[PDB]
Amino acid sequence: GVKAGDWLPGFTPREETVYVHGGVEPDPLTGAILPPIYQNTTFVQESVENYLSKGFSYSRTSNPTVLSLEKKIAEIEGGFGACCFATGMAATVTIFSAFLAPGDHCLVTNCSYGGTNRCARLHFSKYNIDFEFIDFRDPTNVEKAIRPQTKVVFSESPCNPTLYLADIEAISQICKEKKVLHVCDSTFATPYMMRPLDLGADIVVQSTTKYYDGHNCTLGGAVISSTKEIHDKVFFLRNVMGNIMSAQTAFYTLLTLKTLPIRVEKQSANAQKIAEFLSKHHKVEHVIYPGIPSFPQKELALKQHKNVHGGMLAFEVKGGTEAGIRMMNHVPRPWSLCESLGACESIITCPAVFDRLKVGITDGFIRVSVGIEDVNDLIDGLDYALSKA
Amino acid sequence: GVKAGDWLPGFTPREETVYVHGGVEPDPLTGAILPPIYQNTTFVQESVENYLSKGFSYSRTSNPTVLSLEKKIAEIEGGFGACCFATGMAATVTIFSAFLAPGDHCLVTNCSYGGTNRCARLHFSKYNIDFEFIDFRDPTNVEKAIRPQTKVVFSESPCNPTLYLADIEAISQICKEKKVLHVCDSTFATPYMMRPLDLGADIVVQSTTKYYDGHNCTLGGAVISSTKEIHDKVFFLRNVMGNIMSAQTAFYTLLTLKTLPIRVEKQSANAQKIAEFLSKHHKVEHVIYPGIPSFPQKELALKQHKNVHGGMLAFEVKGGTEAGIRMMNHVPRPWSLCESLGACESIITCPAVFDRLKVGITDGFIRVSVGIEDVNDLIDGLDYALSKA
Amino acid sequence: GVKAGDWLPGFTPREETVYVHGGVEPDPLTGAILPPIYQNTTFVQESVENYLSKGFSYSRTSNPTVLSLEKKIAEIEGGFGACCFATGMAATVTIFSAFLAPGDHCLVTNCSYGGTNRCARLHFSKYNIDFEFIDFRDPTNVEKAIRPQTKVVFSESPCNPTLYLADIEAISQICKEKKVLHVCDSTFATPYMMRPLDLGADIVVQSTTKYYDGHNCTLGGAVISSTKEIHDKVFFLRNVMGNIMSAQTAFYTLLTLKTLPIRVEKQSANAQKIAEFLSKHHKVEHVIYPGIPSFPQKELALKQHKNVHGGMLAFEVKGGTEAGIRMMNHVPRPWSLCESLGACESIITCPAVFDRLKVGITDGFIRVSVGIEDVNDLIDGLDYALSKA
Amino acid sequence: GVKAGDWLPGFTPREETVYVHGGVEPDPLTGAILPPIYQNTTFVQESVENYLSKGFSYSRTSNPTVLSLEKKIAEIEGGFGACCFATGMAATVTIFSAFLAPGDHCLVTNCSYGGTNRCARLHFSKYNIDFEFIDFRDPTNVEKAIRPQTKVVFSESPCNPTLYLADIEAISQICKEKKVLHVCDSTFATPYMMRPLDLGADIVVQSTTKYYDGHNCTLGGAVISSTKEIHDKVFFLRNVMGNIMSAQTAFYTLLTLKTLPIRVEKQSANAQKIAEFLSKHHKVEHVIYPGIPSFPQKELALKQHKNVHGGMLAFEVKGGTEAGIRMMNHVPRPWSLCESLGACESIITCPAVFDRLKVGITDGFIRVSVGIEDVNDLIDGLDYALSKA
């Protein structure tokens, strides 16, 4: 006995259905199929006694549109709850703010996203928090570097920009044994390819700017928590730091998330073909893509990646820095020369120009974000650029 | 000589590249990869003499964000130019307002979208314009029905809600011989499946509300004209009728159009499987889908549809009206019971309750718009509803 | 016995309170003090039987945000109901579309807004509708020009750009005697200065673009009807023409309307001072402003205008067209040289350059929209411009 | 030589002109009178060498719409530069993050906004930063409380919710002598009433949520710095913390700031009349408003407030807590029972329920934010509620 507008009780929607509908139901007041945008700072209360009945009071603390996105994101990533932020850096910084105090130690991948690196070094370390950067490719490095003061192990997989993988299940096992928080930044992967919470991570951080948005439209971040205790700590501190996502951003991301599976499938199919083309090009010294046989962590890629190997790839042009620069300066449309990644629009950048040599970022190293354009235009443009290297 | 930011000279970008990038280059002032939203009524002029240098004066007439969308739409549909409107109905009535005058005769598909039918009968016919509704399935019917006062032949394909097809190329040949304007509403098809301007139509009308948007987010319309003379008449009259699209809607549509190929591929693959499922179901009386082998206009569908047979299908439940209604009252989530079509969210519609019998709209007749959810959830939901019917 | 969140029963809110709160109450579901933006095309129905319970089905026909604005506008203008449109021209054109048929006659002010003029002449007259342009300054001209075929008398007061007044109560008396519809465009006045429905008009048309918005942000129109029968006709035809306002525009206008009284008071105080300054300047041949003693319809202005004499003024520079042009070309910031009016930003334009001499628009004639800047900057800028005339 | 579009050289525009036009010129590309919304994540670079020519790379770092708002805010507040943030709390915590390090002492008003108090105690003090809450009413208290480790003196004026004043100029003289940073939160005052940078403060923090917005529409924060060195530290750290304002919020705030002078004039005139009414009411125990003659810091208010005494007031109901609660449960529309302040809509707040006794926040203590409704409706509503108390 269930009617139009109910899910059938006892059934779990399958993956692509969750991207379309998770966290959202038609508006109860009007039936609007999309939740309205609560572009609104404050919420009227029925009486002094009934404060917070209806659930809301002030949009810095929580907002209904933002909360619909958080419910969707928690379902997609497999978490107890999620908090959404103005940016991915805000999400990351809130984890550092909540879980570290002076005297604590934090292990971070040495090939982090650069911003994560700069916020650790140039900011939180003034609170006498010890950040140690290590090679997460071997989990025993993590196990050996954990101290009694270690509170957080912060992995990223694939890693910005070298696309190293971290074995998330094994690191989680180590972190569970040592009772330390395992935080994983899986922005490059997407939950469609890898869900760190499924593999035992305690927290996931996402830049929703990148693939969740996928359109170069909005900035955003999310923290997805494995437990209520962690979630409530993140939520409380978000209210204090004032870095919640806005209702309009959340509306845009509720919309673009619906297509994340078909976008990432297309981007990943394009990236596989581009990586194969570059691996045969004589001006190209090395290609990094988890889907080609030369990838050094192929075994882990096949264990840890679902569905696809992602839209990110990297390569090194022969001839070092001058050659990388000539190539960049001649990459034609439809490519865009710019920062960011994950978008329908294909993007290329040179991480070093825009030492570093021990992090993998060699002289002619190029990070490529593959979009959903026709792959022949993308390949023709790279081939032209490489003719100038 | 080609540098970053230039297209390779002498290359036509491929189709999916045009969906991503058509009509848009990075902002010249800032490099912004998306054009900014010109949420702005009026445009400052540098002098009386240099009036309309920079090209804009007032947003009812033209607006830069709307103009970017129009360039993209004209490129995708293969037209000389496009005009964007607040809604598909505004686009349609602007065509009727511009190209019909008292004493004129207009042939319309008798299976027209019901709105198009009702603006003709209940509104424009008070101006002594004669609208004749005829069966467009056989082009010879069109040729035979043309009269000395015929000015417009207004086809639609597939037709709302019965999915009858019209042979656009054959009708265009007839219209070209008799010197009559051919207008085609290809809302249900999408330029990814069928481009009437390639098949000889003089004008295309689109409800961008449906598939161009594809997210239940915005209303919009577009008129794509084969020639400059037609385009300039539409543009002039849009300014007079005050029914242009807004900048914010144009921005949303510029974003959602980038994924139209992958969305329509996913929706159409889902629709093919749903239509096969329904065609085998013992409580289903008839199934209409241009891609299943029993489709009555199979030969024209294979000639006229490019990649897919679309996301729309229709079927009738055995047991007549009471069974159709019981079925629709029990269709569970992920389905939505509502009007409209074309969206990521799958939609089930009852065309009678949201004579009718003469041209297909039967008792238990159900119009289905297939979204991008997991097809197995969609089928599970219909199978539940059918078992309750 | 009434509590927080109720109006006291039996009391009518006063004028400025209606601009702040009319048509809107906190969201029942969340208490949001502002209504959320229903950026949403379609609305899910509970069952086939309960179609249109909850009130909505499709945003071309009606949308909740748009309806909140319509309720506010109907209260502010004193009408039974209001319909909102994509633009003021759409509102006007819908009145012509609904109330005129071939053979009918329509009286229109000869100093109309130009667009109204061009849509009558260059478009509706092809339906054999006879538009006659007359001098509304004397009501007996209206009474003498009414024919048995006259269905609409269309007044505008103050008139674009000459600021002639029409005696709205007297014209209404004439129209009631002859049983013809009196439609008044009171865009230049605002309901804060004159409510034609209070003076017996049957319909008001507004470009909400101008003062209701007041920020050069959105386009919009409204039709406010004196009766249910008129309202329902406008509503039905809006659904057919597809020219409804969007939810986002309605949200912007729900916000900017809150300040219309304080904006228009400031603009009107500035305009009075500017008009006094120009009336003494030796390069200025004539100044038109209802608040200065030289205004020809001063008696009617004092009868018909409440609170203020408005933010619009006009003047003629000595030396004809070349002098008007030199002046325009040298009007400095904070002035903007552009079309439109009613905004926080002061705007100046020359109507003729951008015969006409019998409509009042003389050679050196300048239409001025006064904003809310400091009046000394505005006057200093005009004085500088006039030194170049 | 000055032409349309130029300011007169050597003239400082007056204050209300800067609210309308500060930081914004017509779009160079199109003449758009409002800057377009750069709803856009990343910015295309023309070459490796010309990196950050055009001035933008990524919206977390800087965005053109946000930068226009920052220029306007810096002009209005009288600063070298401004940084805009997602919220006022983000602005505040960015100040604490940049200018405090372990071992540092910080003096804060004991009547600080409660959020500011709770980010200090419950968060930054875990970094061995000592926050001391002292009575800022007498500047000598500040001078006496400074210690060798004092780095920041953080004043607020008027204070949330008690409306205590701090003598900003005297405190700035003390801070300049002791070489200590003076930060002033003048959210309640608005730059129209009081500019701390003019009174010697080193930094101003604003919740733009409140009066800059004034419409309950957006969240936002701003930090306005007296020097380049301070501004560059704030900017660098905003990029690291990921808490910048978004382009859409900056667009709303650019619009709402244009009317801040006339809004605050209207709200303050209403608040003066409400405060006089309350001061005469037999069920009112105490009334706090800086403009009524019994205000305890009347002399400083007359020295420090420019045009108005603001829209905030507070009062206590006779009969203690039960009476205050009965009163608030019966305050009718147009009042809203909720958090926040500064808006067109009048708001009544209970600060305890939305120790406290030591610094003013008594039993029946009610915080009132006066909007721009008709003052007689506002008073009628309070008089009804008071009669029920």
Ligand SMILES: *Cc1c(COP(=O)(O)O)cnc(C)c1O
């Ligand atoms: C971009 C990014 C971030 C930072 O997110 P923003 O949204 O840019 O603040 C963090 N981690 C990774 C892997 C990232 O790519």
Ligand SMILES: *Cc1c(COP(=O)(O)O)cnc(C)c1O
């Ligand atoms: C929906 C539709 C229309 C009308 O478009 P709106 O955007 O709803 O005004 C016209 N033709 C077809 C085939 C349609 O489906």
Ligand SMILES: *Cc1c(COP(=O)(O)O)cnc(C)c1O
């Ligand atoms: C501007 C105007 C119009 C047209 O309104 P739009 O919003 O520009 O379509 C109609 N009447 C008057 C008096 C006007 O000023």
Ligand SMILES: *Cc1c(COP(=O)(O)O)cnc(C)c1O
């Ligand atoms: C509201 C407020 C804040 C915090 O600003 P948010 O925008 O709510 O984060 C800081 N100071 C005062 C005085 C405030 O009123």
Ligand SMILES: *[C@H](C=C)[C@H](N)C(=O)O
């Ligand atoms: C980070 C820029 C600060 C950006 N997302 C990138 O990786 O390019």
Ligand SMILES: *[C@H](C=C)[C@H](N)C(=O)O
């Ligand atoms: C038309 C509603 C008036 C709608 N697009 C439909 O066909 O459902």
Ligand SMILES: *[C@H](C=C)[C@H](N)C(=O)O
């Ligand atoms: C009309 C332009 C077509 C505009 N509102 C004006 O009067 O300037």
Ligand SMILES: *[C@H](C=C)[C@H](N)C(=O)O
């Ligand atoms: C703060 C809520 C956390 C709010 N601006 C208030 O003081 O009401």
